[PDB]
Amino acid sequence: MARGPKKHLKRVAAPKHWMLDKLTSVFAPRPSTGPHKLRECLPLIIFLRNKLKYALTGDEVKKICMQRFIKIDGKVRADITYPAGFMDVISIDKTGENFRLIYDTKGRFAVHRITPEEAKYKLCKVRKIFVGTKGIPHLVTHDARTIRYPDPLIKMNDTIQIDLETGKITDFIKFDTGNLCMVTGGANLGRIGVITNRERHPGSFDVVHVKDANGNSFATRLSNIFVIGKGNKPWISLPRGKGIRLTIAEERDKRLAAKQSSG
Amino acid sequence: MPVARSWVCRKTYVTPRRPFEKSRLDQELKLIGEYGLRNKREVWRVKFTLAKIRKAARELLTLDE
Amino acid sequence: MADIQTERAYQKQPTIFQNKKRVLLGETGKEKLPRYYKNIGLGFKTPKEAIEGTYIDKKCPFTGNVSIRGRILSGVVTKMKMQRTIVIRRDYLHYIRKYNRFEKRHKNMSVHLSPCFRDVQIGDIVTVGECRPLSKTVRFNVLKVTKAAGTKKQFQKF
Amino acid sequence: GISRDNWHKRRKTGGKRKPYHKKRKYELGRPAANTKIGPRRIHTVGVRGGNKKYRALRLDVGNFSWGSECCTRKTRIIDVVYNASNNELVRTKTLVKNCIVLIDSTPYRQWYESHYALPLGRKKGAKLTPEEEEILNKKRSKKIQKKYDERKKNAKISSLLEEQFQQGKLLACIASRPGQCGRADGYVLEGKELEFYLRKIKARKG
RNA sequence: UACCUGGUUGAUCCUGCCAGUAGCAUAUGCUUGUCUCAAAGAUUAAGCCAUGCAUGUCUAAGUACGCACGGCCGGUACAGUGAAACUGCGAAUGGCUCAUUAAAUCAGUUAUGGUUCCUUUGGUCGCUACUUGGAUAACUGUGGUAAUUCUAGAGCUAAUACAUGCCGACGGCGCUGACUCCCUUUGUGUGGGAUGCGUGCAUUUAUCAGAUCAAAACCAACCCGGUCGCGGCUUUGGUGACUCUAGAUAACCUCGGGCCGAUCGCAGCCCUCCGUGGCGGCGACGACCCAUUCGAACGUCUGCCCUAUCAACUUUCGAUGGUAGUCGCCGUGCCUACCAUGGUGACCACGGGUGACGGGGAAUCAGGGUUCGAUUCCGGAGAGGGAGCCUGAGAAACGGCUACCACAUCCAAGGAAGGCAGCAGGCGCGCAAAUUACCCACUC
RNA sequence: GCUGCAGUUAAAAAGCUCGUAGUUGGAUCUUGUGGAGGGUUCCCCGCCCCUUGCCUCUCGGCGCCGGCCCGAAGCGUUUACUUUGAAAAAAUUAGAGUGUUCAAAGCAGGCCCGAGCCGCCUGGAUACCGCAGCUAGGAAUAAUGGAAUAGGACCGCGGUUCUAUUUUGUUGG
RNA sequence: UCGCUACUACCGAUUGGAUGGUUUAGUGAGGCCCUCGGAUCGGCCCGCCGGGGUCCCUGGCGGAGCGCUGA
Numbered sequence A: 001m002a003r004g005p006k007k008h009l010k011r012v013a014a015p016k017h018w019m020l021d022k023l024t025s026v027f028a029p030r031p032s033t034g035p036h037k038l039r040e041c042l043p044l045i046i047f048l049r050n051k052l053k054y055a056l057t058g059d060e061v062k063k064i065c066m067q068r069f070i071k072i073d074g075k076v077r078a079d080i081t082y083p084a085g086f087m088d089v090i091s092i093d094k095t096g097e098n099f100r101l102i103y104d105t106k107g108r109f110a111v112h113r114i115t116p117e118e119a120k121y122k123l124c125k126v127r128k129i130f131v132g133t134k135g136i137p138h139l140v141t142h143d144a145r146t147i148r149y150p151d152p153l154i155k156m157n158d159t160i161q162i163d164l165e166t167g168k169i170t171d172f173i174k175f176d177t178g179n180l181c182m183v184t185g186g187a188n189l190g191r192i193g194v195i196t197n198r199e200r201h202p203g204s205f206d207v208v209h210v211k212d213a214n215g216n217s218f219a220t221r222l223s224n225i226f227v228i229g230k231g232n233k234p235w236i237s238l239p240r241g242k243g244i245r246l247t248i249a250e251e252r253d254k255r256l257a258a259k260q261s262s263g
Numbered sequence B: 001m002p003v004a005r006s007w008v009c010r011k012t013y014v015t016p017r018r019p020f021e022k023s024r025l026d027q028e029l030k031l032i033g034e035y036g037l038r039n040k041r042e043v044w045r046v047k048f049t050l051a052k053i054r055k056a057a058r059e060l061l062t063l064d065e
Numbered sequence C: 001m002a003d004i005q006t007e008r009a010y011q012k013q014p015t016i017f018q019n020k021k022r023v024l025l026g027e028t029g030k031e032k033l034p035r036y037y038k039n040i041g042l043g044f045k046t047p048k049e050a051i052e053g054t055y056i057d058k059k060c061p062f063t064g065n066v067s068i069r070g071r072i073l074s075g076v077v078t079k080m081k082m083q084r085t086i087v088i089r090r091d092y093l094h095y096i097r098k099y100n101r102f103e104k105r106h107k108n109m110s111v112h113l114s115p116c117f118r119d120v121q122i123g124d125i126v127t128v129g130e131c132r133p134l135s136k137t138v139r140f141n142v143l144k145v146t147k148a149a150g151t152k153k154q155f156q157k158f
Numbered sequence D: 001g002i003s004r005d006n007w008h009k010r011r012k013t014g015g016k017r018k019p020y021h022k023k024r025k026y027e028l029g030r031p032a033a034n035t036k037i038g039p040r041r042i043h044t045v046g047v048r049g050g051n052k053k054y055r056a057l058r059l060d061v062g063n064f065s066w067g068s069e070c071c072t073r074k075t076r077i078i079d080v081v082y083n084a085s086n087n088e089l090v091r092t093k094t095l096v097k098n099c100i101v102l103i104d105s106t107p108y109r110q111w112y113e114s115h116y117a118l119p120l121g122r123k124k125g126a127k128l129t130p131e132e133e134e135i136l137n138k139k140r141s142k143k144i145q146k147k148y149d150e151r152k153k154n155a156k157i158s159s160l161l162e163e164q165f166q167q168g169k170l171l172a173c174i175a176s177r178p179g180q181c182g183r184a185d186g187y188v189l190e191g192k193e194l195e196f197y198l199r200k201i202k203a204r205k206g
Numbered sequence E: 001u002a003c004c005u006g007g008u009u010g011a012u013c014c015u016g017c018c019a020g021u022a023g024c025a026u027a028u029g030c031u032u033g034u035c036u037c038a039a040a041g042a043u044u045a046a047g048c049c050a051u052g053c054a055u056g057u058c059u060a061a062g063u064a065c066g067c068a069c070g071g072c073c074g075g076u077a078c079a080g081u082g083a084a085a086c087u088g089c090g091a092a093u094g095g096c097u098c099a100u101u102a103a104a105u106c107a108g109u110u111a112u113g114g115u116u117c118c119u120u121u122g123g124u125c126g127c128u129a130c131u132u133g134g135a136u137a138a139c140u141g142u143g144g145u146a147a148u149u150c151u152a153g154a155g156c157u158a159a160u161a162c163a164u165g166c167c168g169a170c171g172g173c174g175c176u177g178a179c180u181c182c183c184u185u186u187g188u189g190u191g192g193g194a195u196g197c198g199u200g201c202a203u204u205u206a207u208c209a210g211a212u213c214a215a216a217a218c219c220a221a222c223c224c225g226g227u228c229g230c231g232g233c234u235u236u237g238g239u240g241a242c243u244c245u246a247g248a249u250a251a252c253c254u255c256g257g258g259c260c261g262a263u264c265g266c267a268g269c270c271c272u273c274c275g276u277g278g279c280g281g282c283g284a285c286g287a288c289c290c291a292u293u294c295g296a297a298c299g300u301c302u303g304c305c306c307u308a309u310c311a312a313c314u315u316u317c318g319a320u321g322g323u324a325g326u327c328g329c330c331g332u333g334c335c336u337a338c339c340a341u342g343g344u345g346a347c348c349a350c351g352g353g354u355g356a357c358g359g360g361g362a363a364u365c366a367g368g369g370u371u372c373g374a375u376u377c378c379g380g381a382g383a384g385g386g387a388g389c390c391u392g393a394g395a396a397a398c399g400g401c402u403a404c405c406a407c408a409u410c411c412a413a414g415g416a417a418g419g420c421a422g423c424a425g426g427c428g429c430g431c432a433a434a435u436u437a438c439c440c441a442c443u444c
Numbered sequence F: 001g002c003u004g005c006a007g008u009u010a011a012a013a014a015g016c017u018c019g020u021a022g023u024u025g026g027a028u029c030u031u032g033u034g035g036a037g038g039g040u041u042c043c044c045c046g047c048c049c050c051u052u053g054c055c056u057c058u059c060g061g062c063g064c065c066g067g068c069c070c071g072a073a074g075c076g077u078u079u080a081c082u083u084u085g086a087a088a089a090a091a092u093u094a095g096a097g098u099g100u101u102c103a104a105a106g107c108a109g110g111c112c113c114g115a116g117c118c119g120c121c122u123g124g125a126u127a128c129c130g131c132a133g134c135u136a137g138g139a140a141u142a143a144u145g146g147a148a149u150a151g152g153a154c155c156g157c158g159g160u161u162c163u164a165u166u167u168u169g170u171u172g173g
Numbered sequence G: 001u002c003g004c005u006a007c008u009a010c011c012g013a014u015u016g017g018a019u020g021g022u023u024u025a026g027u028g029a030g031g032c033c034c035u036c037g038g039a040u041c042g043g044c045c046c047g048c049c050g051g052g053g054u055c056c057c058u059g060g061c062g063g064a065g066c067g068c069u070g071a
Helices: A044-051 A058-065 A248-257 B022-035 B041-060 D106-116 D146-152 D159-165 D191-204
Strands: A070-072 A089-092 A097-100 A102-104 A108-110 A121-131 A137-141 A146-148 A159-163 A169-173 A180-183 A192-199 A207-211 A217-221 A225-229 C069-079 C085-096 C101-112 C125-130 C140-146 D041-046 D052-059 D061-066 D071-082 D100-104 D169-174 D185-188
Touching (some): A121 A225, A159 A225, A192 A225, C101 C125, D106 D146, D159 D169, D159 D191, D169 D191
Parallel strands (some): C101 C140, D061 D185
Antiparallel strands (some): A070 A089, A089 A097, A121 A159, A137 A146, A207 A217, C085 C101, D061 D071, D169 D185
């Protein structure tokens, strides 16, 4: 029977992009309730144990966090299954290093090291606009942040930049044609291109057409488009491969020609 | 009960349909004697890997160049 | 028309009020009731008979308390012995894949039809959209009526 | 116990259905409030999600609006006179939404007479002159009579209410749900609603 | 590897079936050296169960007068380790089985503009008071019954348990209008103004406003550039679509029965300042309301095995629909009153059967197919059979409670106690299925 | 036995005829020269007669010295079909890489001096995922439709009734 | 056709037997809701004594009404 909410996760039921092995276990870490959806996050334990390899077991992760070393968006978090997600920054002040979560072009989180002056801000997509009591205007972002008194030009689907020490808005990018974006869901996940057309339907879903640096074309539902730069230039540094999504025949040929992986 | 095991496995040979075909019996024994094998199953393994190779090449030859 | 209060309780539109002040009209008069009506969206148009009419119907899309959302469908008017509701027929082909051949099937829907449509007949074509549950078996409401792509009511001069 | 499910009853075709599961708690129902006229008795119940709901068993007083005059005040409830749904509800005096009731006219009369500087409910001079004339006439420097044309040129009430005010009672309609809110509360009957219910009241018994 | 062979006659050519040949999964017989994997009381009986275990929990930070153990001596609230008990949280997840169930469950697809939501994360948190009240548990002391995780009478004492309730920061702004001053006795244009009443967000009801467009001509009175007839204009946000969001007015308000802190732990400070007025650094715990996250619930479209030795069926004993209401978290014949006479079927309704839980899937396979799916992932249902209900954000819960029905244990015959389709183990059944072992090291 | 069986005599065509549902249903309504890729004429532009078939606005950028032009929109009589986008758990199946000592499996692993490298490189692909719903091109085949008790259209006129309440300097008439 | 030995099914007296589902009429445990009930337990009003003070606070003994008022 199901008389209330569930609190376990089977390892074959867990999100594919975490890359968990088949044979160590029956269970996987259930992500803690928080700012990002269960299908769309990376639990902090998988980042420290499986990606960075600073710990060999979940107990070695627990005694890294309880020493207060780990910051997410500039706040110290002691919870080992906290749901980190897209555009967040992780700082490890004791080893002296900083990371940002961004998609690899195969649709998984890359490790991406950043300089300490770039670790001071993040980019946020707008979800909602509304007016409260005494006529005060409010804004809501993709990561549950609520802001009072936004600039009256900031509309739906726009991108805003915030400083992490104060949480207030600094600058913004309008959703319109010719701006650079990244794709955050569907089959096109982890690709980058410029917006070239928006096609709209009254009821059901709008569709956006996007163009690559190499001149390829692709499309997706409007809910999967995140804007990252005015015109041709991004407001964030980008990982190896820059979102170009080369095919399996091109990938074979570079792997043979470059002789990488200790050939 | 749930368990951390896995259950994937497969067979690596097939038995012939005619058990006592005279033309088949001495052909298989000549391959055993020339290559120094233990039994008939050790020949039926090699016929099965060749059949799977030819089954794949016959599919790819249907598609456009 | 000339009377509408045929029920045991008084019938009126919500959100409309009549002032009992400045009531003088002389030897003649004008309508004591203004009319409430709305736009449905989705490129539909509100009938003249809803704006110029005097009927009360709470389940009406144009002049009552319903929201049009989800699927839009069409079918053929086939029975109308109930009051403010009708039955429509939907016909389709089902594919059976062992054979390479089709099978004819049908379903019926009960739908709500307001006044403002008043010349519908059996064999007319009707367009409908989803609502909240309106009664036990009713989930859809009439948005448009037509007799295009078919023969006339009476002779060809209609 | 009592339940409000859809699965106990038959489908469009006339065919039966068999039970899918035992009764669930979210399918629940409870007995009716049956609110009477009498001094306040209210009880409270815990509801799904841990919220509270108020159930009125007896009420003597309510809040009513005279929408024509923009006046609303706390008022005594006297009697019930019509119910569109069932005659046993007026025979046993039970209070529900869209019930028709009699209320005390006094707080509306006192607002009107002090606002317009005119009498309303009065029969003859013996109920005008001997007391409370000093509500109507006082010293009013440059506000005495002509400046009250802002009042006097729009003071006339409908004939159907001036006949009610002389008897000390008005007809009103209940707008709240008393078995759900704990309150009995509504508006004064006027115009064609008043003509409709006066015909229905007279045609039933009179 | 897209395949056949024996058998009707005195002999021949056919039809047609029987028998052979290969795989797969249940039982069973004979036989057995090494090494890596690993199914296993589903089929019959969702039949019955001796014994043991399977759910508990404390930090610098709710309550420490346990001589229980202890220090250099002292309570300056009071040290320090701390059994017990009170308070808080969890026990609604996990694990087991497949009886019921054929438009039901379930799958793909869509919707809440028809609802609720512990916790996390972000907003919000100023219409006797230098600190109030009484009363229980652990403990001490005296008992009752054949008997249980049974409990009674007496003496003490706590709070983040239970119950009260200020101070500070009212200085709001609208409505009344004694009087008073100026052009014009009134009306009508003014500026002051004694004095009363209401005045945060939630709650119930009623009312108001929501601005934009095309073209002139007269008249009362004037904005304004100017003076005794002409130029020129202005005001929350949002959806395909709201009786949306925000705003204004008149009242209500829940009280014993909505919010706005009588709480706890670390380092100390700055001064009309000698221990005073405060202001303040880091927190911990708590609570009303938005938005999130995890969901749950209800609804849309299309999809099902055999059967006519099942052809008509449903219908105030609610069947289909309308109007008003009750009940409910909310839409709705969900239920009640009044009214209408409807709704489904040869394109198979209604009725009956199923060694029927649905799906991802599995065996065999030239191409097309046939058969299977109790079973590790996902959804549903149920804890001997039916029914009712407490607590809580969440249950109609069974390692919770109350009763009837079927079994059955102890007794001093008055009474008391019970639920292995959890893990091992036993009886019964049958062709048919393993140890009453070790550990929280790994995964959670 | 759909692909794919059989019914004179081996098993098997109702004694005969009518007929509602079901399945099936005759012919017909716009083409060749020129250029690119490729050939020695036909698939993309523009044309005998129409090439998105029409059209003229207005909120809204372009081209140039106001006016005239070229991308949305009304939309092309309605559907099936076909080709293309989007969106659909993982494991299983197919399939790429990789000397578990080989293999069935697994998701790993590979370079370099000595230990002074306080290390470096690299994988965890990809396809399939009926039907039903969503979407943009094609127009053969098969459904479906318009004026015979004449209506399409012109910057065309006329009587009469309803009526938003704009443009005027506003509040009122 | 009649006769001998095996094996399977049919008809049927018997008011047969066991198990299960529908359903008329009568009875009805136990919970929840509503209208009543009131065992027992407190406070605030009238003496005396004591601590503080310009007869009241407030601890205690104690009796009449056991008023009024709460659980």
